[PDB]
């Protein structure tokens, strides 16, 4: 429990964002390939 738990649930979602950005980084290696092939 805390006074405004929303102050940390915001951090819990920012951890998920940092992960989405890594999935997008691997897709960024393949974006090069999908363009030089076309």
Curated annotation (Swiss-Prot):
It comes from the Eukaryota. Residues 19-27 are annotated as: Important for receptor binding. Changing residue 22 to A: Strongly reduced affinity for ADCYAP1R1. The modification Lysine amide is found at residue 38. Transmembrane segments: none annotated. The modification Leucine amide is found at residue 27. This is Pituitary adenylate cyclase-activating polypeptide 38. It comes from Homo sapiens. The gene is ADCYAP1.
């Amino acid at each position: 429990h805390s006074d405004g738990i929303f102050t940390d649930s915001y951090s819990r979602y920012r951890k998920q964002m940092a992960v989405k950005k890594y999935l997008a980084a691997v897709l960024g290696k393949r974006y090069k390939q999908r363009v030089k092939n076309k």
